[PDB]
Amino acid sequence: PPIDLQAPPRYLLKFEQIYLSKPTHWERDGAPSPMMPNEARLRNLTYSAPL
Amino acid sequence: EERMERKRREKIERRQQEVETELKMWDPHNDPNAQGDAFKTLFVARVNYDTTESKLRREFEV
């Protein structure tokens, strides 16, 4: 259910639709990387994609 | 000493004229191969010839 607030000003904040990317991993520079499943296994990463 | 400079000048002018003819005949923007927004499209070169399309996808979809 959308969340409504009152301080008067009222807000709606309704969610519409979801978009799921593919498994990606960022270093310090911000470079996304394609985590090989093997790479996640090796580096103890988590095979997940941002939502 | 001079015939060489003459040949360099002719080959240079000949190329420059072919350049004007190519610019007049072919239009870069009006290219069927080129598609999509120009600010969105990207250019990658020095790519190995053996790079499979899927390999380029797995490397640039990240």
From Swiss-Prot, chain B:
Component of the spliceosomal U1 snRNP, which is essential for recognition of the pre-mRNA 5' splice-site and the subsequent assembly of the spliceosome. SNRNP70 binds to the loop I region of U1-snRNA. The RRM domain mediates interaction with U1 RNA. Component of the U1 snRNP. The U1 snRNP is composed of the U1 snRNA and the 7 core Sm proteins SNRPB, SNRPD1, SNRPD2, SNRPD3, SNRPE, SNRPF and SNRPG that assemble in a heptameric protein ring on the Sm site of the small nuclear RNA to form the core snRNP, and at least three U1 snRNP-specific proteins SNRNP70/U1-70K, SNRPA/U1-A and SNRPC/U1-C. Interacts with SCNM1. Found in a pre-mRNA splicing complex with SFRS4, SFRS5, SNRNP70, SNRPA1, SRRM1 and SRRM2. Found in a pre-mRNA exonic splicing enhancer (ESE) complex with SNRNP70, SNRPA1, SRRM1 and TRA2B/SFRS10. It comes from the Eukaryota. This is U1 small nuclear ribonucleoprotein 70 kDa. Major ribonucleoprotein antigen recognized by the sera from patients with autoimmune diseases, such as systemic lupus erythematosus. Transmembrane segments: none annotated. Residues 1-16 have a biased composition (Basic and acidic residues). It is found in: Nucleus speckle; Nucleus, Nucleoplasm. The modification N6-acetyllysine is found at K55. The N-terminus is blocked.
